[PDB]
Amino acid sequence: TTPGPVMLDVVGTTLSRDDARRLAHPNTGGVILFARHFQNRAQLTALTDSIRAVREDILIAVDHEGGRVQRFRTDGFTVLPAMRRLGELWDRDVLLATKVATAVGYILAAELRACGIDMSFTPVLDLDYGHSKVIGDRAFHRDPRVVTLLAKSLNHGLSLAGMANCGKHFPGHGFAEADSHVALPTDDRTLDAILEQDVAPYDWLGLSLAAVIPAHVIYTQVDKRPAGFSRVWLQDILRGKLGFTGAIFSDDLSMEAARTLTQAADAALAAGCDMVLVCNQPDAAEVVLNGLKARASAESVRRIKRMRARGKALKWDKLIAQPEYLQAQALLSSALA
């Protein structure tokens, strides 16, 4: 079986019959996990194993950014800094900040891999303008050159554990005021202004950027469609001008800005997303699985398969004794308050 375009979630800490039905659907390609899916490492590892047992080619993801966005924060998961802390470190010592960013990435990925997770939806490449509450301390820095090199160093750490990455929220959520969870944010800047600054990290990262999530933000001088439903943003700019060949994941179609779910999914995929997220309503996601309009998918499937974690990973009982992991832990503890 090959991955479908929909990433959805499961009902709880153990798989149900209804989850198994959805996981077997040809239009399912992923699972996203939240805090409610985590009781402890043993339970989470059993859950991810059970998911892969139903659907061998499934991608399993989570939001592990650090700071305010980190689903698993107990039973030995390391509580990671807000990414803003790394930009503050850079302002004091550029080179140390890059070293610490790698150590954070390695820890982040290695601990996720130990529980059988493929990837985290990180890094946030949004610029820290100070304008956006929803982003806030999730942004690395104001300066796109600094965002790029800190995010690159983080992504390097992720790669040391065989993990990919996903830059977000393209072409930039940092400037717009509103929260896309609960409203429809707008950004009235010119295309050239957005390209010069906010898009620059996506371009400069090159092969170091594996995937993107687009913002549910309307860039009113560029397209009246939100970026994840915009052929202009996803094809003309990201695939075209930037030459990007990695996976594109819609932002959560359950979010107010994304406003049927099936129509929004079809529109996201037509615009250029390879996978669509439907979070926190699995029955409604099942309606999407069965209602989605047919489309060419071979090019999307190549990209989706390339988001699976690479190589072997250490289980927890080995990771806890690994010198690299221990060195990374010591550096985090000493370099950051």
Added chain:
Amino acid sequence: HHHMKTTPGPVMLDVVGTTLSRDDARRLAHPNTGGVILFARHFQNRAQLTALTDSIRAVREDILIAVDHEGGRVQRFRTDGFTVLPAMRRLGELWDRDVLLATKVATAVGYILAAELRACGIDMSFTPVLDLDYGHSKVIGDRAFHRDPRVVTLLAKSLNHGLSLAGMANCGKHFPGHGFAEADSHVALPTDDRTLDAILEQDVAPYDWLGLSLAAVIPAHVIYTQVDKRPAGFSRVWLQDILRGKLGFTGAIFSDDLSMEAARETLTQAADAALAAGCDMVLVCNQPDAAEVVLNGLKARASAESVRRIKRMRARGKALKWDKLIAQPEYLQAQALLSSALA
């Protein structure tokens, strides 16, 4: 399948030719062998090279296979589709025009370098050179990225990221820095008379700053007269007190080639001195019979931790075969960027 229970030994040696002989097979099965380094004489074409690396792994399942693919003046395989890579100095020149572009190009170069080697069954390249470009060292020359250790660090880091995208590790060299000394360690014993603080401030800084982005190190056969009378690869002060100790380095340490004239400061004694000082593996190049004397004479017993470090140098994950690689969009993007950005 390997019928015999073995663990990798400390010696990295070479084979006699383009196909394995009986005598190579004997050396590859010796308990003290842990790796093979390939040179230009081992390369006729990709098909032959891939068969040779496969044949090496079949004799010794846990063997590490390495090559010097730096780019520029140091690149063993340059034909039958291998991409001729720039001298690392070119990346530092690009940095001086456009820092961010340089970092993007460095990753592209790393990815091409590693992916091509993976397609032919090689684990790793002995790159990056972290030596600083003082303009003093002919043996280093355009192999150095840049004068400034901060620039060397970030370009090398970006290169190593590219290597990691293809599942390949890396090896920083030649620690604590070959760029300041004049002499060529292939034919002479170079000296460097700077204070420890001066050497730590600049030349060692990339090793410290790279952190986990640095997988391994080759020490220089250079005497740093203010720090230790022993060349760095035979110095417990350099390897234990500075590298393992001060810097907390946990990766593999490979001696520089013990066949070099500087290493004469016998082969077996030199290997034992290198391993005692802190090397996990020793290189013995271009004299397989002499390497075999070392195999049978070596006193060192490898620790479990050296074995772990050596095993972690093996390439990770699945690699694309050549015909798939050259049609891959990401490889094609990397090639296009090299062609445009370095013109």
